[PDB]
């Protein structure tokens with residue numbers, strides 16, 4: 001699909017109480033340092049765009065990854081005509097007709113009805129071009145400069161801005177530089193000025209058209225001017241062509257077709273949201289050397305840096321997809337994440353722009369381990385192992401960094417119930433320990449590999465054979481009483497025992513043994529899927545959107561609206577019964593579409609988009625760090641996958657209509673494939689992946705199972 005037909009209002013119909021993706025209409029280049037979006041309201045906090053709004057407050061320069069993290073280093077540009085007594089966003093706001101507007105990754109185009117202005121914003125990595133067509137005779141641009149700001153007019157054609165605003169930052173004076181070069185001159189001089197919450201009305205007089213070339217920096221005003229100088233000669237049409245080519249570079253790596261073209265539209269909307277995050281957070285100096293801002297030391301440092309990622313979300317799907325088709329990006333992003341460690345002492349958890357420390361676990365360990373077993377940045381793995389061992393053995397004095405209850409986990413083999421979300425912390429630490437083990441193994445550090453492989457079995461500490469759930473446990477080894485299987489929070493993050501008891505990616509075979517048998521585990525999975533989507537709110541004291549999103553649909557406790565349940569259909573693959581989940585996976589993919597209500601829950605910076613892409617192709621990385629993809633049920637009829645190693649994997653299904661809900665047979669390069677998984681190596685060889693599909697199941701009797709520590 002051509003990038004101009006992607007509508008960025010996909011997944012934007014949200015509020016605090018209910019998510020259909022909690023996406024913004026991000027205009028930008030892939031991994032752009034800034035994104036650009038219309039702002040329709042300043043009265044709904046982080047939810048500053050709604051597709052049903054008919055009000056336009058301005059073009060917002062944003063770094064907002066989610067409404068939960070909020071924004072950093074934002075400002076607005078608002079075309080105006082005539083006098084304005086008061087410069088507030090409300091006083092300057094114009095209605096607009098959404099149905100006559102363009103919302104695309106490479107272009108925003110809309111008409112402010114109040115002013116008879118039509119304007120067009122095209123993005124670049126560090127800036128963009130805003131073209132403004134005026135019908136009236138006293139023509140302006142309003143700059144809204146939140147937080148502490150500085151602004152000056154350098155000449156008739158040049159303005160420079162600095163803003164200090166953020167939701168959370170280690171640097172209380174965290175600064176963003178923004179420069180504007182105008183084709184048509186300013187007709188009113190103003191003196192350099194500074195303040196809080198700036199409202200600056202630039203004047204151009206009676207011109208029909210203004211063209212604003214803008215750029216930006218987290219380094220300096222001088223760096224922002226160099227970023228601009230690199231593209232100042234481009235026309236809007238040339239910058240648009242370049243931005244379309246940048247997106248085509250990534251879109252061309254997954255060319256797919258479907259029986260239903262609605263499914264193809266959904267695919268490419270999700271693919272657009274797979275190459276936004278993490279955002280570029282470095283610039284190239286006068287010598288083309290990567291530099292970035294280090295909020296910890298409050299200085300400019302050398303090297304790459306990336307931002308706007310919660311690894312709790314993105315480790316699931318984004319980095320595994322990059323491992324197949326964007327290895328060059330994965331390689332540079334790992335270098336940034338290590339720089340984050342170099343600068344703070346701990347591998348990053350939630351970057352926006354710097355460590356915000358939200359969500360359980362240090363799932364960055366899975367991004368590292370998956371890369372190690374796939375031979376991505378082997379050069380960095382000794383530095384990563386040292387970083388991982390430090391996180392697994394040393395408690396940070398600052399609450400947002402590394403592991404919580406590190407020392408108690410080492411003493412007890414679990415985080416005790418006195419800690420918040422102890423079950424998640426425990427299971428995330430045991431999976432991290434598997435990940436550390438895998439990195440050690442790739443480096444032939446046998447002693448480290450062995451110790452961490454044993455630590456990875458600590459999930460067994462919270463398994464209650466009496467209930468068949470993971471439950472919180474006190475320092476004397478007693479399960480918290482008054483257990484209710486559907487009670488959310490307290491011991492579990494954003495779920496009940498049902499959304500929390502299966503985070504054992506390292507050893508499903510061992511979790512299955514705790515149940516007693518492949519059959520007793522099967523019974524639990526059937527009960528998880530086939531029950532009503534009931535919840536109890538006591539752990540929170542109120543209903544939260546993740547509960548509402550599960551209870552909105554009839555898929556039992558398989559809460560596809562949130563990351564904890566993402567792997568659930570694949571659990572059937574660990575008892576040799578993948579056929580039980582093939583229909584379920586096609587039914588789950590139908591909860592996605594290209595509309596403003598198009599996701600079942602928070603998209604989270606590529607995480608749920610890449611869930612959809614992988615499942616569309618029919619395989620899924622259950623266990624980052626194992627070098628495998630568990631087989632599911634494809635929705636495509638064809639895919640040409642351009643692998644980073646330069647080979648092509650061509651996928652072909654038999655006719656893949658609604659009634660096709662099972663896999664009959666798979667041939668990989670004309671050889672019957674019976675295993676319920678593919679190795680990463682197998683897919684990297686390229687060739688032909690043929691799925692013969694069925695209207696009834698073809699049960700396999702193969703003993704073959706995906707990776708588990710306890711059986712390797």
Ligand SMILES: OC[C@H]1O[C@H](O[C@H]2[C@@H](O)[C@H](O)[C@@H](CO)O[C@H]2O)[C@@H](O)[C@@H](O)[C@@H]1O
Nearest residue numbers: 066068069310313359544545546602604
């Ligand atoms: O974007 C940050 C983080 O957001 C998630 O959780 C949000 C919100 O959805 C949830 O209701 C409350 C629970 O009190 O927590 C907020 O931080 C979370 O799903 C995660 O996916 C994401 O990284």
Ligand SMILES: [Ca+2]
Nearest residue numbers: 562563602604
């Ligand atoms: Ca989420």
Ligand code: NA
Nearest residue numbers: 020597599600
């Ligand atoms: Na939805």
